[PDB]
Amino acid sequence: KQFHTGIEIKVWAIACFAPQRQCTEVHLKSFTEQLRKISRDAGMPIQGQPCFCKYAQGADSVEPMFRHLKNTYAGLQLVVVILPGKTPVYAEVKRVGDTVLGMATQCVQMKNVQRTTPQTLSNLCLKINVKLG
Numbered sequence: 397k398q399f400h401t402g403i404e405i406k407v408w409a410i411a412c413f414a415p416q417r418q419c420t421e422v423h424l425k426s427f428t429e430q431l432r433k434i435s436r437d438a439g440m441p442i443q444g445q446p447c448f449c450k451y452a453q454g455a456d457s458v459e460p461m462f463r464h465l466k467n468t469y470a471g472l473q474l475v476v477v478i479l480p481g482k483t484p485v486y487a488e489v490k491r492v493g494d495t496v497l498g499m500a501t502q503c504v505q506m507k508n509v510q511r512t513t514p515q516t517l518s519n520l521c522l523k524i525n526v527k528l529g
């Protein structure tokens with residue numbers, strides 16, 4: 397519905413389910429910096445430095461990674477999950493986050509990490525605003 401003010405995202409993680417050869421460390425850093433700058437300008441600042449950033453492969457890797465994050469990072473507010481197109485990883489991410497460990501997740505397509513637009517960054521900011529606001 398309406399846009400929420402006073403969101404600060406201080407503790408968040410990236411779980412990259414895209415293969416590193418397609419979605420590289422510099423894609424991740426660039427995507428993050430852009431998200432930092434637009435979230436800042438909208439008054440919902442996402443700190444530039446995620447507390448965790450790792451590559452993973454398969455739905456099977458989701459629950460153990462999320463258990464690890466929950467057990468490791470006090471005050472974790474959000475996991476940003478990067479998906480290489482349509483994959484059962486999405487449903488597992490939402491099973492574990494929404495209905496097992498009570499962990500906010502935001503999924504994003506790999507193509508929107510490889511190449512950002514103001515518009516796709518805005519889409520993401522609004523989805524995140526609704527989740528954490």
Ligand SMILES: Nc1ncnc2c1nc(Br)n2[C@@H]1O[C@H](COP(=O)(O)O)[C@@H](O)[C@H]1O
Nearest residue numbers: 479481482483484486501502503504505523
């Ligand atoms: N089966 C699926 N596989 C991959 N990405 C998916 C998917 N279903 C959905 Br919805 N998505 C992606 O999930 C994004 C939204 O994730 P959230 O539900 O965390 O907001 C969409 O923008 C879309 O790109």
